[PDB]
Design an enzyme around this catalytic site. Structure first.
Site, PDB file in Angstrom:
ATOM      1  CD  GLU B 249      26.747  33.597  18.431  1.00  0.00           C
ATOM      2  OE1 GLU B 249      27.359  33.209  17.406  1.00  0.00           O
ATOM      3  OE2 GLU B 249      26.291  34.760  18.555  1.00  0.00           O
ATOM      4  CG  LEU B 324      21.547  44.666   8.163  1.00  0.00           C
ATOM      5  CD1 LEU B 324      22.518  45.839   8.367  1.00  0.00           C
ATOM      6  CD2 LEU B 324      20.311  44.829   9.047  1.00  0.00           C
TER       7      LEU B 324
END
Lengths: 431, 431
Positions: B249, B324
């Site tokens: 990407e 995260l």
């Protein structure tokens, strides 16, 4: 090439058919109506006798067949439910499992339905596969009948494949749906009617809902409908149309009625032109009989049927599904306490539409199904939602801001709740 | 075509270039380093003079360039940010809004990055698109340089296309990456260094993780990687490989290094063989310079690059992304308070692997990054997750029960939290 010789050689009773299944192994079975009652009763009782233990049963979509046999709570310690999706039958089991000193009785396996064949075949492994089938035809073939889903792959990946021949099971054409007798390891026979899906009536809202939806159905639409009363009812408004296609996860009575009426023709489809495609079928006896030897029907495996890239190859795909709650974002929740593949496919389809439909209210008008926030994990995320519909109308969420989205979603709420909902939106800073 | 004649009929000052944009229209711009500073400043100034209002600005990935011009809080009443993904810049604006008496100052537009091109072009509609381009060549073409993403579509679909020529902007080949002067409505010139992503210093856990991930990178792997110092460190460990491919990407420095070192040949790819594909690039001046007129690098639009079906077509796709948080289910959360397309694409790839990785702890070992359950919405649903990695190892979650998931994920947590996590597992009955 004597087929009658092999059949009579594999023909047996449930008890010996299931006798060789080892403890500590992995078994799986057809979905819903393809669950083999005699084979299952034989297995349940083998378990009851404390004859087999530590058996994981991996499956999607359980019915009373497995519910009332091998998935009885008492057998739990010996036959372990690895449900890849929670039905009422496992909600029963989980509930009863908590009111028993909080033991864990259902092992949930998180899974994409369209990856089930790969999961069961390659990641999980299945040593025994058991499936009801239509009777061996003159060429030495049973049909998987109402099932294709993952079964058509597992029937061949499992080290042993056991089928319960049942004349009540329709002979259904499909990719890998036909199984040669040389592919079967044991045969029991058990001609009994097939289990049914309950017809449940049109809430008055369904009327207005089904009419908003039909104007959302284009010319030559290629349908996928959820199992449910709303979708069934929507097909009732599509008796009007011509040249619809069918590419659906589940073949339901409403869709079959459209085939029977000559409404569904499949002549506009790019893939499987001329045939209605489904990956498994659920309904009532009427549907089941009408499926037998039907030449314009073709079951396909789920990793074909539920693949968004495949779904999107048909123009004007229409996907229509129910949910319980919609929030102001507006994600959707269809859990009491798979279709996502079509949500994606329908929008990717050229001229496509994903429609998630629901009554704005329930509990005689006291509970709003349009809520501020789904807590917690949603079934269709907010970035995937296309169209949503209540008796108060339809809105396309795609490209709307959090604000635009909350406002239009409130307008679709029951006016009784628009007030609270606008307030909830303001504290949330959606608006 | 006399392109000299054309360049002058169109060359202009930023102030004039932006003067005709209408109020209550929709504007969009290139991503990150393709955001055009002079054009944007001219535009922020227009709003400062009260010369324009109700301008919707739709975008992705925000740089300090728009942060300090058209997205200054002062202008939020005339230039309205319709951000399709919330970053640091929007996080600040939102904070000021709530402090400034609960003002909603950022409009979030929830969306699939891979659907951006059509969302912008069809569902939203863009009237003016602005993008920093490489300088016009002898054939009359500019290059979108570090951009392609949704930009290559929108520069065509937008009703007016305004370019900022910047000699610092690499000339980059790609699908629809080249734009002929005839297709450009106005040109301003502004030769300034490209803004750069901040090189983040390593952390000790990144070492072990890069080694664990590297063991998972098969031969002729087809890499996609997120930015960050972890993946950068990974491309370090991958220094010794041969015949790797790129279908990513974002193009980062780690990936460009492997191209420079000759590790990436793109010879095992099925699509774009011999060419590293990306949809947009982020890095530092060195990378940007290297990209210029590179014949083995090829930008493509996001609806191609991030389409899991396209991704899946390359064998041995390896997708590496950081998160995260990871819960015991284990859904993942990479937000404070796009890559999903690769998670699915990489698992569908023949021999493919989606890897999501995180240090097991944060804040000098005080907080677990492995938690009982993710609060609100997740960024990687549990049913999609493939491999997760911490400094303590890797597990493939596909096909594991909730229990097996909980138990293995726990063992990837830092030893200080494992007992807490284990208790939580039973409270949630994951056992």
């Amino acid at each position: 090439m004597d087929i009658r010789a092999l059949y009579d050689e594999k023909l047996t009773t449930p008890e010996e058919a299931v006798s060789s299944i080892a403890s500590g192994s992995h078994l799986s079975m057809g979905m819903f109506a393809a669950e083999p009652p005699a084979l299952l009763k034989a297995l349940a009782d083998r378990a009851t006798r404390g004859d087999i233990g530590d058996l994981r049963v991996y499956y999607f979509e359980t019915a009373k067949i497995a519910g009332d046999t091998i998935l009885r709570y008492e057998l739990n310690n010996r036959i372990k439910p690895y449900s890849m999706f929670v039905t009422a039958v496992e909600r029963a089991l989980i509930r009863r499992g908590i009111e028993d000193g909080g033991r864990k009785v259902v092992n949930y396996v998180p899974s994409n339905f369209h990856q089930a064949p790969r999961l069961l075949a390659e990641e999980i492994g299945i040593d025994t596969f058991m499936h009801t089938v239509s009777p061996m035809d003159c060429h030495g073939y049973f049909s998987l009948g109402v099932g294709n889903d993952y079964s058509s792959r597992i029937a061949r990946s499992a080290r042993r494949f056991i089928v319960e021949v049942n004349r009540y099971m329709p002979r259904v054409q499909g990719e890998a749906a036909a199984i040669h007798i040389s592919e079967v390891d044991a045969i029991v026979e058990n001609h009994v009617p097939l289990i049914e899906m309950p017809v449940r009536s049109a809430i008055p809202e369904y009327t207005s809902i089904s009419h908003i939806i039909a104007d959302l159905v284009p010319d030559g639409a290629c349908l996928q409908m959820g199992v449910g009363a709303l979708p069934n009812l929507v097909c009732g408004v599509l008796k009007d149309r011509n040249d619809l296609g069918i590419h659906t996860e589940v073949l339901n009575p409403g869709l079959v009625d459209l085939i029977r009426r000559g409404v569904v023709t499949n002549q506009r489809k790019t893939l499987d032109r001329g045939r209605s495609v489904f990956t498994f079928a659920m309904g009532q006896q009427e549907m089941y009989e009408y499926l037998n030897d039907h030449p314009a029907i073709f079951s396909r495996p789920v990793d074909y049927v539920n693949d968004p890239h495949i779904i999107a190859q048909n123009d004007n795909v229409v996907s229509i599904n129910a949910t319980l709650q919609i929030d102001l974002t507006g994600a959707c929740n269809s859990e009491h306490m798979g279709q996502l593949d079509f949500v994606r496919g329908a929008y990717a389809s050229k001229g496509g539409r994903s429609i998630i439909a629901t009554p704005s209210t329930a509990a005689k008008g006291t509970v709003s199904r349009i809520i501020p926030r789904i807590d917690g994990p949603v079934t269709t995320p907010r970035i995937d939602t296309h169209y949503i519909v209540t008796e108060f109308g339809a809105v396309n969420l795609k490209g709307l801001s959090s604000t635009e989205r909350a406002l239009r979603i409130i307008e679709l709420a029951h006016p009784d709740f628009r007030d609270e909902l606008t307030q909830a939106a303001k504290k949330m800073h959606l608006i």
